[PDB]
């Protein structure tokens, strides 16, 4: 086509979606990880995760307001990945890299799994 | 912070949100423009438009499944702007630039209004 493109548009959209999340605006699901609860937008979860994409395209699960993750999933690893979904920024540290990689493999977030594998290989 | 960043994350999120829109997955509102109906995600509309942001943060309107725009709004100008919201690509042409600028001013999409003003000034 003969379209023009606004370079910062996608980043600005994501920044505003994170602002809605921080104010709990139009969040439509709560993700339960052990005792911890995380409010989010189903569409953002689907756009970032192969697991949420499969869950919310399912004719029955698409209507659930509460999703319980496998008890092996660490709430801190999930929190770091949820923050990544809404910001593109990953808080990867020596003390969390194993929990982050395991959570990303479960959530099916291929690019996060790839950087965790590379960072582990380096050490 | 000591975060790492995935450069393509925001663009990949937006591409997946557009894929959900094209398949009509988790769309929660229909925008009526004259006779034409457009299905979309409230969160994406809010993230892109000052008008939708005001509408869906309103305690009563946040619950509406149908939003009717002012009858002066052109359905083609709206379609071009809705496509821009989900792709960062604006199909700006000599034959549509006036309708696109008027719709962007109404929707409060400041960056689109700015490029329309510059393109009109050049001609």
């Amino acid at each position: 086509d003969s379209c023009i493109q606004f370079t910062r548009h996608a980043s600005d959209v994501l920044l505003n979606l994170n602002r809605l999340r921080s104010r709990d605006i139009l969040t439509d699901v709560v993700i339960v990880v052990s005792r911890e609860q995380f409010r989010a937008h189903k569409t953002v979860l689907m756009a970032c995760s192969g697991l949420f994409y499969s869950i919310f395209t399912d004719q029955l699960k698409c209507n659930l307001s509460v999703i319980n993750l496998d008890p092996e999933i660490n709430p801190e690893g999930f929190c770091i990945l949820l923050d990544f979904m809404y910001t593109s920024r990953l808080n990867l540290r020596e003390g969390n890299i194993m929990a982050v990689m395991a959570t990303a493999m479960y959530l099916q977030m291929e690019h996060v799994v790839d950087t965790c594998r590379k960072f582990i290989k380096a050490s | 912070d000591s975060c790492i960043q995935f450069t393509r994350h925001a663009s990949d999120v937006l591409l997946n949100l557009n894929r959900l829109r094209s398949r009509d997955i988790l769309t929660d509102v229909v925008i009526v423009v004259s006779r034409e109906q457009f299905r979309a995600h409230k969160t994406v509309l809010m993230a892109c438009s000052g008008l939708f942001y005001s509408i869906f943060t309103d305690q009563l309107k946040c619950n509406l499944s149908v939003i009717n725009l002012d009858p002066e709004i052109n359905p083609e100008g709206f379609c071009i702007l809705l496509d821009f919201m989900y792709t960062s690509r604006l199909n700006l042409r000599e034959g549509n630039i006036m309708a696109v600028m008027a719709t962007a001013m109404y929707l409060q999409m400041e960056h689109v209004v700015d490029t329309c003003r510059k393109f009109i000034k050049a001609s």
């Binding site: 379209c3 023009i4 493109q5 606004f6 370079t7 | 690509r89 604006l90 490029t115």
Partner: peptide
């Protein structure tokens, strides 16, 4: 704005 750019030419994509």
């Amino acid at each position: 704005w750019v030419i994509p």
